């Protein structure tokens, strides 16, 4: 019997700062125990200061990203070159995904950018288009390895102030872009060490009011 | 079934056994598996009898209509029509067809169309359940540009062995010779070929 789905591995990570957002992903593409590519970009600049990644089955991921990029193009044509806001992009993606409700896009989709007040935004989708705005979201193979660490280090979960002994929570202080990038890199270093599908390279796209910047880092290749 | 088509100096010869089985019962022992789609374009049929008969009738129709409009079709054209049917309806068909024909320009040509619907032009071709047993023999004994008598003997010996070992094959060995001279039908009975 023909199976229309496959698993290309990969792991992605979105983090929303106060006036910025990052969307990172490893650059390894795999099937089963084989490496297809050590550098196959997975996180994409879609225009209008929106970055997107559709991790899982790479064909469905490519198809969805392509369709959303085209949705941005036609939004410009149909609405007098208006900027597609991140919230509007998110709702548009829900409909793209739900449109294939009974033959889904086998992917975990994450987008990142800035909301209309200039603050950092990350949105996270299931394969059939249920979505929500989130501060923090890892997706794909090693998401279970990364998210608990982000609960602890970003949101200061289960952390309290020394001396009070469980009475006063550690306050939720804002993280800089340099601080967030350290967490991303170390999350991927940890995921690389413990998950076989994670490695080769890490590519991070950083969204600010000034635009979309890229950074690349080597990851362990075995 | 044991079928083959072999090019030679003066053209091409098609050969086939005559057994059709329903399980272990021989439903027809005098089957004619060499079927005519045009004057000098014939085919050897293997697989579902219903399917190969249905296909061969459709091809005959297409080539008749081709001839009405554009004159005599090439053997390649006939093979392409067979292919188109077999490939596009691969999910609903079980047909392994060898196509053989004589042009004056191209001389003898043999095209084999296995289960997938792929086409393969070859100097000779073997097919059907009994063909497995004669790959070794046919590869060792085939030469190009054989005479008519050599090619009749090559096919006779080959199918004799295919028949000997394959239970699904048997009966008479029919042949159809395609040359500039015309179309000749040959038949060879068990008492002749079994003693080879």
């Amino acid at each position: 019997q023909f199976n229309p789905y496959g698993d290309n591995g990969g792991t992605i990570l979105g983090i929303a700062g106060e006036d910025f957002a990052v969307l990172a992903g490893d650059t390894r593409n795999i099937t089963d125990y084989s490496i297809n590519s050590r550098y196959e970009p997975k996180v994409f600049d879609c225009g209008d200061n929106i970055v997107m990644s559709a991790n899982g089955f790479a064909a469905d991921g490519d198809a969805l990203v392509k369709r959303f990029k085209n949705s941005v193009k036609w939004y410009h044509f149909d609405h007098n070159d208006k900027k597609l806001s991140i919230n509007s992009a998110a709702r548009n993606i829900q409909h793209l995904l739900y449109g294939k409700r009974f033959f889904p896009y086998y992917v975990h989709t994450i987008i990142a950018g800035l909301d209309e007040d200039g603050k950092g935004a990350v949105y996270s989708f299931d394969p059939v288009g249920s979505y929500e705005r989130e501060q923090c979201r890892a997706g794909g193979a090693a998401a279970s390895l990364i998210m608990p660490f982000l609960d602890n280090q970003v949101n200061f979960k289960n952390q309290y102030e020394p001396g009070t002994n469980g009475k006063v929570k550690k306050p939720l202080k804002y993280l800089s872009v340099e601080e967030v990038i350290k967490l991303v890199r170390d999350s991927f270093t940890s995921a690389t060490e413990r998950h076989i599908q994670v490695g080769d390279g890490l590519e991070i796209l950083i969204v600010t009011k000034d635009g979309v910047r890229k950074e690349f880092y080597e990851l362990k290749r075995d | 079934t044991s079928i083959m088509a072999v090019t030679f100096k003066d053209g091409v010869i098609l050969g086939a056994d005559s057994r059709t089985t329903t399980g272990a019962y021989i439903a027809n022992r005098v089957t004619d598996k060499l079927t005519r789609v045009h004057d000098k374009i014939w085919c050897c049929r293997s697989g579902s009898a219903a399917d190969t008969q249905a296909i061969a009738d459709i091809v005959q129709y297409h080539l008749e209509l081709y001839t009405s409009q554009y004159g005599t079709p090439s053997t390649e054209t006939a093979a392409s029509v067979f292919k188109e049917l077999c490939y596009e309806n691969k999910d609903n068909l079980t047909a392994g067809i060898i196509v053989a024909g004589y042009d004056d320009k191209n001389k003898g040509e043999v095209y084999t169309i296995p289960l997938g619907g792929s086409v393969h032009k070859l100097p000779y071709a073997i097919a059907g359940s009994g063909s497995t047993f004669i790959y070794g023999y046919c590869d060792k004994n085939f030469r190009e540009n054989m005479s008519k008598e050599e090619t009749v003997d090559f096919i006779k010996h080959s199918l004799s062995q295919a028949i000997k070992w394959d239970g699904s094959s048997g009966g008479v060995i029919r042949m159809v010779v395609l040359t500039a001279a015309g179309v000749e039908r040959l038949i060879f009975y068990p008492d002749e070929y079994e003693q080879l």
């Binding site: 297809n36 089955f57 | 999910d91 997938g116």
Partner: protein, 224 residues
């Protein structure tokens, strides 16, 4: 939904400083039966692209016709068909990639793995993979099916990352490919000694080599 009947095995390929090399053996297997010994599975498109195909041969032959038809169609009302508006590797690939994913999405796939190797207008090396699921990826070395397991390890020792491509000459790259084809012949049960190889260089153009053979074969240790 179908099943592949007559099949082709590994297609292997790599980038080098000025272009790309691609290779594939001349066998059409019918299960365990080594049925057809004269099957060409590298199909050139213009003078700047070679499409190497593995998997179902009937579906390959269909794709061969789609590419032949694409050349015809591009020439229509195109005075620059042999110049600025000739077919690019990236165009030929994207077309095939669209077809492959469309067909999987109708549950009626073309049962193949394809590598499109070529050189672009601006001299850039093009090498990209697509399969029956519509999955696509690029890498300095690419190989389908069996070759992914045995050829890629050998070819990656020559070009391990992007920065090794300018350091690799056409002689080193061709040696590596021919060496990898030998290794595949020893170890792939559905391969053959006879193969075809194609170099697409930005200076010397398309060189297509037929009727190559695996040679220098170590069997002498068997007698013991």
């Amino acid at each position: 939904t179908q099943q592949p009947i007559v099949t082709g095995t590994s297609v292997i390929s790599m980038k080098y400083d000025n272009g790309v090399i691609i290779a594939a053996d001349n066998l059409g297997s019918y299960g365990s039966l080594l049925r057809f010994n004269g099957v060409e599975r590298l199909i050139p498109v213009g003078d700047n692209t070679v499409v190497g195909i593995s998997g179902d041969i009937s579906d390959m032959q269909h794709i061969e016709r789609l590419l032949k038809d694409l050349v015809t169609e591009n020439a229509y009302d195109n005075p620059l068909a042999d110049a600025e508006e000739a077919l690019e590797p990236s165009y030929i690939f994207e077309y095939l990639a669209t077809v492959m994913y469309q067909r999987r999405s109708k549950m009626n796939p073309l049962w193949n793995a394809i590598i499109v190797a070529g050189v672009q207008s601006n001299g850039d090396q093009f090498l990209r993979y697509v399969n029956l699921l519509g999955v696509t990826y690029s890498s300095p070395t690419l190989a389908t099916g069996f070759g992914a397991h045995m050829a890629n390890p050998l070819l990656r020792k020559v070009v391990d990352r992007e920065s090794d491509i300018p350091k690799t000459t056409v002689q080193v790259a061709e040696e590596a490919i021919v060496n990898a084809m030998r290794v595949l012949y020893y170890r792939d049960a559905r391969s053959s000694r006879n193969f075809s190889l194609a170099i697409i260089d930005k200076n010397t153009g398309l060189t297509f080599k037929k009727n190559l053979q695996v040679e220098n074969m170590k069997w002498d240790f068997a007698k013991d």
